[PDB]
Design a protein around this ligand. Sequence first.
Ligand SMILES: O=c1[nH]c(=O)n([C@@H]2O[C@H](CO)[C@@H](O)[C@H](F)[C@H]2O)cc1F
Ligand SMILES: O=c1[nH]c(=O)n([C@@H]2O[C@H](CO)[C@@H](O)[C@H](F)[C@H]2O)cc1F
Lengths: 812, 812
Amino acid sequence: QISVRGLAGVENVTELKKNFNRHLHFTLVKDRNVATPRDYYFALAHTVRDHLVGRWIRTQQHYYEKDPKRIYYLSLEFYMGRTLQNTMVNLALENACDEATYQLGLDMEELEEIEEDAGLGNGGLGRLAACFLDSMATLGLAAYGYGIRYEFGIFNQKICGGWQMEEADDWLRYGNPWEKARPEFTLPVHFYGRVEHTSQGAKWVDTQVVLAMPYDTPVPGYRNNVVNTMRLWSAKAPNDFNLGYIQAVLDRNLAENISRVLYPNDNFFEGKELRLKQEYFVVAATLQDIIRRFKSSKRTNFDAFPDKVAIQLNDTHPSLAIPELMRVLVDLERLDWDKAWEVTVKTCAYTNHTVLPEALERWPVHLLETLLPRHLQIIYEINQRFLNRVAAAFPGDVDRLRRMSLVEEGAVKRINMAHLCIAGSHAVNGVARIHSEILKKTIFKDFYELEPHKFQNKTNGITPRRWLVLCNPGLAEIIAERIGEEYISDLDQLRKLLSYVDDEAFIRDVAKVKQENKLKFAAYLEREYKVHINPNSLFDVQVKRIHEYKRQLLNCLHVITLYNRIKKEPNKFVVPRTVMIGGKAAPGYHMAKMIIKLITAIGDVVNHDPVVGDRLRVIFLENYRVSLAEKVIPAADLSEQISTAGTEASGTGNMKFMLNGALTIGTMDGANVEMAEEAGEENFFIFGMRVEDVDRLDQRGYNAQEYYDRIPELRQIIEQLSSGFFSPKQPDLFKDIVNMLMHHDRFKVFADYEEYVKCQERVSALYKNPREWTRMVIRNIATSGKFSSDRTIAQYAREIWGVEPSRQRLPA
Amino acid sequence: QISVRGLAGVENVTELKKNFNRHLHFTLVKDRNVATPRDYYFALAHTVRDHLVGRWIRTQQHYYEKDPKRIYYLSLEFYMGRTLQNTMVNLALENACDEATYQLGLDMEELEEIEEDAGLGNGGLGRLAACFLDSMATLGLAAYGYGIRYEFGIFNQKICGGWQMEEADDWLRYGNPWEKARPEFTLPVHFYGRVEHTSQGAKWVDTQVVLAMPYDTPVPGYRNNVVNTMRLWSAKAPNDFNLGYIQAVLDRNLAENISRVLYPNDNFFEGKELRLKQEYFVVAATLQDIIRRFKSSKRTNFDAFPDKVAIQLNDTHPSLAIPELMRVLVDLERLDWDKAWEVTVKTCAYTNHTVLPEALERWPVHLLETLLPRHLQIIYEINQRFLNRVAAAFPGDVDRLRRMSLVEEGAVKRINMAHLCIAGSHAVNGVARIHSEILKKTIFKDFYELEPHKFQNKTNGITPRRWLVLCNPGLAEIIAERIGEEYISDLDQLRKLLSYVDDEAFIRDVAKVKQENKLKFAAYLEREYKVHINPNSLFDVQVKRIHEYKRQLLNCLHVITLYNRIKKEPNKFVVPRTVMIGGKAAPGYHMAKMIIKLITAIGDVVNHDPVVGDRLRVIFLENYRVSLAEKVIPAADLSEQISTAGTEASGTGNMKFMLNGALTIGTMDGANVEMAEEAGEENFFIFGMRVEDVDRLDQRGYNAQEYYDRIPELRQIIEQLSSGFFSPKQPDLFKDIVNMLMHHDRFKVFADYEEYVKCQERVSALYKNPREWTRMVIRNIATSGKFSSDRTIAQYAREIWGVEPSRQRLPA
Ligand SMILES: O=c1[nH]c(=O)n([C@@H]2O[C@H](CO)[C@@H](O)[C@H](F)[C@H]2O)cc1F
Ligand SMILES: O=c1[nH]c(=O)n([C@@H]2O[C@H](CO)[C@@H](O)[C@H](F)[C@H]2O)cc1F
């Protein structure tokens, strides 16, 4: 049908149909008379998987023969979404499978909807890991993603009576055709116990043992025949575990609970023992596997270890890799401390994802003492040696010594895991230019002064395979018609589109693709949720995890302003909008749960007011996840990126909207700054305080009452919330929200309100002129190239890992 | 190589090799360079499984079209063992696969050893269910086995310091290629709650829900292209289960624990709540599935239900089927009580497996009250109506009323599940002629008097596929050479062998096959256990679960007698023996654990005494299970079947030894009586008290001291045990054993000692004359035909289920 989806050759289609029928019969044990759409999905998945196998085997054979430096990406989260379409895209099989299934009397898009998301992450950090795996394979790097195979991923969100309810994400119920269990590579992991000192060093004894069983999932590169591996560990009890008899067998669950469930917190640290066990479990199994592969490659020369191994730490979650590597090298391999430390530093690098104090991992010493006694001792020794260096560099500066210590003093002694990561890594990076600068100026200032060479920036990116070709084939096609297909793995080529900004045909085509996407999404909503929207309205979208810093509340204030203005002048023309907000709240985060209730409560009033009509709709998008992002992002006109300046490290949702033809309303925060720089400030809707303005306000003290007193429209909204206008049956329902905004608002919602509302007026003004709206859109798409994760990964490769990317094809 | 293993045609072999390589590549994702023997096993298993699929699909299609009466065999145990070789035998693929793997450079027998036993049973009762499934498929019956998919089967037994240790049987660790998950047929099961009475009958409300997910395993018939189904249920929590958040997800384990582990008790009732949950879980899911299939076949006519459905209860474990069927028919389908009861009685039949009082299920009322409140009410109503019938038949007989009641009075009120099964079944059977007679004379006398027509006998049997063709191909072949292959599904044809009892060639061939089997087994022991035996000795074998009634202790007394006699006259000739005892003890059964220690302790003394040499060896066979039975039984010369008369209902191990060329030393107990009747008493080594003799001794009182006083050789053994001869470091180790034998022996070990020892002398006498030993063996094999489970199943089919067996082939 469309060019970018590849060839549908007679031979290919014939073979696909044949193998589909083989799998339905032999694999699924069904015939066409009893088969359901789910059976058909699985028959297709197995058929496509078969095409990965040969390439997967020979890629791994190639790495053994060539013996390149290996890259190990350690993460507690891999937010993968669905795999079927992504695999077809990367293998150039989409059109062929579409034809084959069509000839069998099946709709492929209907089959695609059956696959469960692999929802093994919370949001930005987890999705970054997924985009990174795609780019590393596309760039021919010998890379492995290592994580945990959670039996339950991020919860499914149901909205009941306007409230979030959580349901278990039982994603493995029907099986996972993509993974391959590798019980033969099972490894032991140790917990608890005690440390014994012998004539020949320390020994960690009397431990409890949990087995780590790996499951491997293929990661295909874009049309280069490279297939890399994501290896996820599952927890298993040993067979003599607890071994009255019945209870001992039932108690195996205690060991296996380690890999049971993903902690559903986003940008928030919870110091629970089970989470610490998860962090060590992934680190211990992964490091053993790395060392095994290093020894088996081509007495043991660990001096060359950093030449053949790079370990990237995604946040501090796998920070225990640092003392674990020291433990293995010193206690087991018998290297001297100084040599082991040199190897460790040159091997490890650390990526920071936030500056919010509540997100920083600070583990109580008493927890580490009980669970990991040898690691605590190693951490104390690292700290002593590090502080000896600080004292030599800054003699007499006693406060610097306490500020920089890995051990924090107080009520409970804690270990600062970020301090550990900086000390034990050769590179530390932030994830956008402004964020990386904030790190050097504020929270890691002391460390930057000691070791300036360690600090880098690597601006985040997204993969243009999932986030353009897959989710928006209509846009991919009209671009390819003009500039060819090379841009899919070289996104900077989108700049060529600048020469079409005055092209009347292109303008019409860009706008046509957006309309079609909006129609399709408007239909999706009616079918699956019985919600009814006007597809001719401006689609105003804010999708991301619910958090006070992201300021969904500022969006709510604007929505109520628009409603109040309509009620004041009902017969005045306004540009129609559909305001869509979606995202999950952490189950324990009360204020985020209250914000969801507020959004639905506003919808309850606005959507049923006869005077409003179809001029304003407010919709909460339930169960926001990767597969939903792929649907809504291509349909969006306006992307809301409105975090308080200095709080969103980078953002990546922002980049997805830019690539897909939405304009951005945003603060100068995270990557928004670089996006505006690339496109031109005149092609962005920037408003509000800059970081420096927030700093000034903090200095004199933020007083929300001042804004309430001086802005009549703001006062009206607060009075409506307080008096029960949006909750008639429970007048005081939103008291906590009002109290927070008036007395305890860390994120200064009122301070950006006036400029936000005015900027929104400018958006509505431009939308009234379709031609100029679309020309600005083209200027955004054309300059989105920098935000490909291929660019990001090439920078990590050259500046941190010391490896060269390759666009060269492996033989098919 | 050998005829009975089928053809190895060029086309077949070529295709098998091709598919083996396909599975290694696509299914296992390996090449020949990295593959292990386990990978090769799996590639073969998938290749063989592929051959089952077409036949499995069309068998189930055939039953839908023909709509025959369906047979449902309900059991908490299916002791299946390994599946690979059994499947090859039944499909006639053994020689072809042997050739194909040979050409690939692999040894098939080595690959077969990799498969884990499906050890989903304890012993005789569970293995009977497995043999029954094989026979039902071979006889073309539309039969389904229904049970629980335990994640952990019967524990693996390790012997440490002479003691039993238990390890978890993690049989699913590497996957199970034979099963197919069917999550689409998942069904809810209800627990707890309360009963509400409405205008329209009772309602069971406020329940907890557990999901039952089925897994289907194919059951191939012998070369008839029939493939039946064994459907095993797995427990799953619903997704809103318990739905702070983390704990709610972790607590799912509580629901899923229902299918976690097999209770390891053999002939012993333990009244634990979890076991009751297992029993209802299998019954509730199974009955819903049966009713669904009945409604979907060809408003709803339940009068015809018993014409299309038979439910066989394997012991009382699934007895809740009776009140569950009443519940569904009365509460849900709204039938009147009397009609529902008629349907229930005509549908259900019950098989009793023991008369030992400690094995009988008597559930406390308080347990049923809390867990299954509606079932308790239904049971009370069944009891009231049943007792009203008894009162009408036997007016004034008040003690009969209390004896026959389903409710037992006392300290704790209990429900007698055997009484429930008799009341609610149209047929009740024992499992050997003597057992069935004991039921009518003793424990069920009252019930027999009320309803004599209900009581039947169905003597147990074993499948000649697993228990001859599979485990003893050498014997199968020499038989086939003379009488053809038809006997494999018509075992009565073995009678033709009586005309070869004087055939010098046949005599030599029978003895040659035994020697080879013994050599192979003697080698297996050295390889896997480093134990060294003389293959020219008489192989004296007792393998079965460890229990006081089975009298492994009587065997021990004989062994010590032989040792003492040798020590008394060292230079006298004795027929050399290897005495082998194996079997598992229930983890909580102290006396059985002590018996295992005694056996190893005797071995410790006997096997290291230089004066004994290789004339006497005592070996404990570790981890006795189905796969081990297949190895040892063909190697045995003497089969020990020495339970106290009246205690072993039938036995089936006895039949396996008879078929495989061992002679039997035994009491007139269970099926031993019918075996001796078939072969002729002169061709059996019968000794000891008959049932009537045990009864007489009980009347005057059993006094063990009398035997100790009158038998000097017995006195010597007891003094050796007491004084610490067999435990020098712990002199009083066996005090409990001596005390039991002297003061509290329910099974009268001393009373059979003299006759047992004398009978053993007659065995040794015959073994000295190889030719006459072998002629007696031929007379046993030739008359083993009655003990085929094909005969047993044909009797169930005609006399209980009302269906006709068929040897007719389905199209391939
Ligand atoms: O716990 C966190 N969970 C999360 O999604 N993040 C996010 O990481 C993304 C990838 O770098 C960035 O784009 C965002 F700015 C950041 O908020 C940060 C966290 F600390
Ligand atoms: O719990 C029991 N577990 C068991 O193996 N059985 C056995 O059942 C076999 C099959 O009928 C018979 O051959 C045996 F006589 C009997 O002991 C009886 C039980 F009650």
